[PDB]
Design a protein around this ligand. Structure first.
Ligand SMILES: *[C@@H]1O[C@H](CO)[C@@H](O[C@@H]2O[C@H](CO)[C@@H](O)[C@H](O)[C@H]2NC(C)=O)[C@H](O)[C@H]1NC(C)=O
Ligand SMILES: *[C@@H]1O[C@H](CO)[C@@H](O[C@@H]2O[C@H](CO)[C@@H](O)[C@H](O)[C@H]2NC(C)=O)[C@H](O)[C@H]1NC(C)=O
Ligand SMILES: *[C@@H]1O[C@H](CO)[C@@H](O[C@@H]2O[C@H](CO)[C@@H](O)[C@H](O)[C@H]2NC(C)=O)[C@H](O)[C@H]1NC(C)=O
Ligand SMILES: *[C@@H]1O[C@H](CO)[C@@H](O[C@@H]2O[C@H](CO)[C@@H](O)[C@H](O)[C@H]2NC(C)=O)[C@H](O)[C@H]1NC(C)=O
Ligand SMILES: *[C@@H]1O[C@H](CO)[C@@H](O[C@@H]2O[C@H](CO)[C@@H](O)[C@H](O)[C@H]2NC(C)=O)[C@H](O)[C@H]1NC(C)=O
Ligand SMILES: *[C@@H]1O[C@H](CO)[C@@H](O[C@@H]2O[C@H](CO)[C@@H](O)[C@H](O)[C@H]2NC(C)=O)[C@H](O)[C@H]1NC(C)=O
Ligand SMILES: *[C@@H]1O[C@H](CO)[C@@H](O)[C@H](O)[C@H]1NC(C)=O
Ligand SMILES: *[C@@H]1O[C@H](CO)[C@@H](O)[C@H](O)[C@H]1NC(C)=O
Ligand SMILES: *[C@@H]1O[C@H](CO)[C@@H](O)[C@H](O)[C@H]1NC(C)=O
Ligand SMILES: *[C@@H]1O[C@H](CO)[C@@H](O)[C@H](O)[C@H]1NC(C)=O
Lengths: 115, 213, 168, 49
């Protein structure tokens, strides 16, 4: 009979005090509004929309949640935009300008010496 | 460079994470000095005060075993965390050699774009690299050909691409648009123009031929 | 693993006795949770290396070369390629649980096909900025220059080179 | 490897197969990745002075 972890999804107490709850790999008919069944368990307190955004809070199996539409919502993350290269057997694109960009990269080298 | 200063002044999570990990482990080590592990108390001055020596040995051993276990768990997890810090420092030492004392050709090793140069900055337990790269922008399409046929010969560009603005044929360099007249100084010849597929007909200009005459 | 349910397991005489050991079970759950969070970052770092989801053009004719065995198969729920289909056919308890990955492998196949269409259509320009189209024969000729061969060696041997690629 | 053999051309010896690296293609496997490396291999040499 059923056991599983319980997870709490929060947008952060500095945004809201609403909460959603994931019962992990539990069938959503034996948990004890919005009850939504996922490949990762039963989600309570978030509504499922049909849009697709960039992932915010990862639920699992392709499903993420966000505080947008407020409250908490579910959906399937977005891999990225959509670019369509106009490829042909005799076409080329050549740049006419440039930008100088500078970015950062942070790396740990040491930790504390304890005895 | 002025925007790095804003974005930081207003991100160092990888450095914060290793500090937090070590403190969370050192606190768990001390918080274990107050568990019984199956004894009458957690204090040796309480087992040495309400038990005779033959009975306090059995209760002291239960504490010794637990505390040894906890200390040895602490020492294993530090070996496993140090082996990970070591690989990060080995990567930082390679980036200092290859991005700061050189120009790298490896893709996405010293930023995203074409690496120009890198600058190091020290951080609390690590290093920040500022990567300066070139990014091309504002592209146009033209039409291309692989070679040009002229006088029954096939001409290929020495270091560029043949392009057409609609009616005329030029040579550019491949990353920046700067068209030039096709001459025998920026092309070379090999073969006749019936084996390449895509050749176009156009004139290749000889600089000596007019000037001399 | 649920430390308490693996050790004791239902009984109640065991939970109060195990409570005497301190935070041994909290440490183990932290250790296992870190591992599971690292497995998704592994996959994000290998596969989500692309800004846009690029598509190949319909005509699908790159100066000859034939990529049909490694481009996605439109007649499938998973949309994998022929070689990705070959590769995928060759490989509850006492507190134990298996979590699912954040990315489905439909999503992973969709990242890989976009990396493929970026390469076949733009060469190496999409890895440094915006994708700039170039014909495939001319990109192959740029690459022959990179290994120190002169680029008419490609254009005068295009058919043979394309046949050798296709057989390999 | 995905950065340096798929998004570019490598001059590092043996990092992307045997031969002179031309290009590389990725495929997804279960819990892994497969790289198909295309390389150029010289053949049929003659001797000269
Ligand atoms: C190349 O891009 C730069 C921008 O990076 C252009 O320079 C800008 O021009 C606009 C309009 O003249 C000005 O408002 C900006 O102040 C300029 N930017 C800088 C940093 O000076 C430049 O004109 C572009 N060149 C071409 C040929 O298009
Ligand atoms: C290069 O030319 C192509 C061909 O028209 C352009 O791509 C088309 O752009 C229009 C308008 O943005 C779209 O509606 C088409 O779907 C595009 N693809 C086609 C027609 O296959 C492209 O904009 C041009 N690139 C530049 C930099 O000017
Ligand atoms: C392609 O570029 C050429 C530039 O060489 C253009 O032709 C010249 O255009 C200028 C200004 O319109 C005229 O003064 C010249 O007489 C033209 N010919 C030459 C030989 O210089 C041509 O118009 C461009 N074509 C397109 C479609 O933009
Ligand atoms: C490129 O130029 C060559 C030579 O000027 C053209 O070859 C001639 O083509 C016409 C029409 O097909 C024939 O009647 C002649 O006999 C050809 N002469 C030779 C020497 O081959 C060629 O057709 C041109 N290419 C294009 C696309 O116009
Ligand atoms: C690309 O190669 C494949 C082979 O892997 C070609 O598909 C086969 O073509 C032969 C005849 O050329 C048929 O007998 C096979 O039944 C085909 N296999 C299939 C369709 O799975 C394919 O035609 C090639 N592409 C092009 C454009 O020629
Ligand atoms: C180039 O010439 C050398 C000889 O100078 C060839 O090596 C000889 O190969 C033959 C046949 O296998 C052997 O019997 C000789 O003993 C070899 N010479 C030595 C000094 O060992 C080599 O095979 C030739 N290669 C080509 C491409 O012609
Ligand atoms: C956190 O709270 C402070 C002040 O209440 C606010 O300035 C900040 O934007 C908040 N952060 C988020 C993420 O909302
Ligand atoms: C939960 O149980 C019901 C009743 O048998 C079943 O229809 C449903 O499919 C179960 N949940 C899942 C995810 O299969
Ligand atoms: C999402 O789209 C599907 C299309 O099959 C539709 O059946 C469903 O009702 C939509 N969901 C919502 C919440 O509108
Ligand atoms: C390009 O394709 C067109 C079809 O629109 C064909 O007529 C032409 O011969 C092809 N040229 C090359 C160089 O492949």
């Amino acid at each position: 009979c059923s056991f599983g972890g319980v997870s709490v999804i929060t947008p952060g107490t500095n945004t809201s005090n609403q909460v959603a709850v994931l019962y992990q790999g539990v069938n959503c008919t034996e948990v004890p509004s919005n009850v939504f069944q996922t490949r990762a368990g039963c989600l309570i307190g978030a509504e499922y929309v049909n849009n697709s955004y960039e992932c915010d809070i990862p639920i699992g199996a392709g499903i993420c949640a966000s505080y947008q539409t407020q409250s908490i919502i579910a959906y399937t993350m977005s891999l990225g935009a959509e670019n369509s290269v106009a490829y042909s057997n005799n076409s080329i694109a050549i740049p006419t300008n440039f930008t100088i960009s500078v970015t950062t990269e942070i790396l740990p080298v040491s930790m504390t010496k304890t005895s | 460079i002025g925007k790095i200063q804003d974005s930081l002044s207003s991100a160092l999570g990888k450095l914060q994470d290793v500090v937090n990990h070590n403190a969370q482990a050192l606190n768990t080590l001390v918080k274990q000095l107050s568990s019984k592990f199956g004894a009458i108390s957690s204090v040796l001055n309480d087992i040495l005060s309400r038990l005779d020596p033959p009975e306090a040995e059995v209760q002291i051993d239960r504490l010794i075993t637990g505390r040894l276990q906890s200390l040895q768990t602490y020492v294993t997890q530090q070996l496993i965390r140090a082996a990970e810090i070591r690989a990060s420092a080995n990567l930082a030492a390679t980036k200092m050699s290859e991005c700061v004392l050189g120009q790298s050709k490896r893709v996405d090793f010293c930023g995203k774009g074409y690496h120009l140069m890198s600058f190091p900055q020290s951080a609390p337990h690590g290093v920040v690299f500022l990567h300066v790269t070139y990014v091309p922008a504002q592209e146009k399409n033209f039409t291309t050909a692989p070679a040009i046929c002229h006088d029954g010969k096939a001409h290929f560009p020495r270091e560029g691409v043949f392009v057409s603005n609609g009616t005329h044929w030029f040579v550019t360099q491949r990353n920046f648009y700067e068209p030039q007249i096709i001459t025998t100084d920026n092309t070379f010849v090999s073969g006749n123009c019936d084996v390449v597929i895509g050749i176009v007909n156009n004139t290749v200009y000889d600089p000596l031929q007019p000037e001399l005459d | 693993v649920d430390c308490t349910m693996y050790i004791c397991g239902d009984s109640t005489e065991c939970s109060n006795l195990l409570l005497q050991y301190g935070s041994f079970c909290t440490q183990l759950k932290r250790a296992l949770t870190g591992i599971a969070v690292e497995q998704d970052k592994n996959t994000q770092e290998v596969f989500a290396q692309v800004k846009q989801i690029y598509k190949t053009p319909p005509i699908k004719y790159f100066g000859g070369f034939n990529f049909s065995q490694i481009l996605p198969d439109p007649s499938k729920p998973s949309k994998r390629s022929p070689i990705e289909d070959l590769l995928f056919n060759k490989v509850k308890f006492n507190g134990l649980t298996v979590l699912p990955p954040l990315l489905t492998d439909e999503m992973i196949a969709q990242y890989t096909s976009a990396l493929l269409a970026g390469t076949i259509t733009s060469g190496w320009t999409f890895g440094a900025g915006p994708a700039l189209q170039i014909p495939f024969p001319m990109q192959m000729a740029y690459r022959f220059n990179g290994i120190g061969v002169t680029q008419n060696v490609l254009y005068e041997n295009q058919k043979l080179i394309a046949n050798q690629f296709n057989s390999a």
